[PDB]
Design a protein around this ligand. Structure first.
Ligand SMILES: N#Cc1c[nH]c2ncccc12
Length: 340
C-alpha cells in the first residue's frame, strides 16, 4: 500500500522513499523524502483542497504562480504527485527543494550578524523585485515564509494569498476585514486599503528587517485594531499631509481622535544596528504608502551597496467565482505536465 506517516496516507512512492515527518504547515502534512531519481532528499507537502472552493483557490493560485516563476530567491516546484484520473485524485503532493531552516526558526534561536542581515535583506528584495515585475503581490511575507539552506541562500515561499496588483481598486472603508498575517500588515489595511498595491509587500519587508535587528517582532498586535496602535506607538502620529491623503471620514476621524504620539527614533529602538540599515528601515516603514520606498529603490540603497547589481537582479518575462468542480479540473490540468 501507500506510504504512511503519523497514521496518515502520504502517497508519494516509489520515486520518493525514506520519509521523515517535518511538521504541519498551512496546507497539511510536510515530510522530507529521498528522491531516488535525483539521489537527494527533498521536501514534500500534502494538499487536500477539493471539498472547499476557497482551498481550491489558494492551491490553484500557488501552483500556477510557482510553475510560472523561475528565480533563485523564489521556491520552485520540482514535481507534483497525484492520481492519474480526476475521480481518483483526493490529494496533491508538491515536491520542492529541501531547505535547512526558515527565518522564523532562525530568529527564535540565533543572533544575526550585520553581514547576515544585509545578505538576507538583499535576497528578499531581489526575489520581491521579480515578483513585483510580474505584476504580482505576495501579500503574506513574514519570516516563516522565507526558507534558508545550509549556506544561507534564501527562497520566498507560500503564494497562497498572492494577487495580481490592482491599484485602481485599492480603496475601501475603515476596519475592513483582512486575511494576511496581522503582525506584518501595513497601517493602511486597517484604515482604507484592500492591499492591492505593491507597497503592502514593502511594509512587510520592513517589519522583517526590524525583526532581524532585534529577534522580536516590531509590531506584535493582538487583534485587528491593536495592530494599528502598535504601529502608531513607534512611528508617532501621522502628519496633516498624510491624514489629508486619507479621504474616508471614518478612517481619518479615528486617527484624529487619538492623543498625540511621538516618533521613537530608530537608533533608540535598535542601538547596535548599522545606521544605513536604519535609514532603509525608515523608508520601508513609512506611514503613507505613496511615500514608501519601492523595491528597486530599496535594492539601490547604500545599505545594500556591496550586493547591488541590477543586471543580476532579473525580472519576469511577462506580467502574470468558479465552483470547486471547475477548480479541481483546473488543478488536474495544471498538474498534468508531471505525469506519469
Ligand atoms: N513547505 C515547505 C518546504 C519546502 N522546502 C522545505 N524545506 C524544509 C521544510 C519545509 C520546506
Amino acid at each position: 500500500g501507500p506510504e504512511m506517516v503519523r497514521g496518515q496516507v502520504f502517497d508519494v512512492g516509489p520515486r520518493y522513499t525514506n520519509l521523515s515527518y517535518i511538521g504541519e504547515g498551512a496546507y497539511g502534512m510536510v515530510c522530507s523524502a529521498y528522491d531516488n531519481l535525483n539521489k537527494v532528499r527533498v521536501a514534500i507537502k500534502k494538499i487536500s483542497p477539493f471539498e472547499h472552493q476557497t482551498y481550491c483557490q489558494r492551491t490553484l493560485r500557488e501552483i500556477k504562480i510557482l510553475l510560472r516563476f523561475r528565480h533563485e530567491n523564489i521556491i520552485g516546484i520540482n514535481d507534483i504527485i497525484r492520481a492519474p484520473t480526476i475521480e481518483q485524485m483526493k490529494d496533491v503532493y508538491i515536491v520542492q527543494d529541501l531547505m535547512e531552516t526558515d527565518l522564523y526558526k532562525l530568529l527564535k534561536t540565533q543572533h544575526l550578524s550585520n553581514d547576515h542581515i544585509c545578505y538576507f535583506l538583499y535576497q528578499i528584495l531581489r526575489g520581491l523585485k521579480y515578483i513585483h515585475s510580474a505584476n504580482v503581490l505576495h501579500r503574506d511575507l513574514k519570516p516563516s515564509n522565507l526558507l534558508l539552506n545550509t549556506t544561507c541562500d534564501l527562497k520566498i515561499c507560500d503564494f497562497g494569498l498572492a494577487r495580481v496588483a490592482d491599484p485602481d481598486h485599492d480603496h475601501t472603508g475603515f476596519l475592513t476585514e483582512y486575511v494576511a498575517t496581522r503582525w506584518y500588515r501595513a497601517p493602511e489595511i486597517m484604515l482604507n486599503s484592500k492591499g492591492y498595491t505593491k507597497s503592502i509587500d514593502i511594509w512587510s519587508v520592513g517589519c522583517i528587517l526590524a525583526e532581524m535587528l532585534s529577534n522580536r517582532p516590531i509590531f506584535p498586535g493582538k487583534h485587528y485594531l491593536d495592530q494599528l496602535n502598535h504601529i502608531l506607538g513607534i512611528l508617532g502620529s501621522p502628519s496633516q499631509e498624510d491624514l489629508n491623503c486619507i479621504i474616508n471620514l471614518k478612517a481619518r476621524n479615528y486617527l484624529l481622535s487619538l492623543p498625540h504620539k511621538n516618533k521613537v527614533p530608530w537608533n533608540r529602538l535598535f542601538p547596535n544596528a548599522d545606521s544605513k540599515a536604519l535609514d532603509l528601515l525608515d523608508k520601508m516603514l513609512t506611514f503613507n504608502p505613496h511615500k514608501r520606498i519601492e523595491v528597486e529603490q530599496a535594492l539601490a540603497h547604500p545599505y545594500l551597496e556591496q550586493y547591488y547589481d541590477p543586471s543580476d537582479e532579473p525580472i519576469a518575462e511577462a506580467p502574470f467565482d468558479l465552483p470547486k468542480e471547475k477548480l479541481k479540473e483546473l488543478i488536474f490540468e495544471e498538474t498534468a505536465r508531471f505525469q506519469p
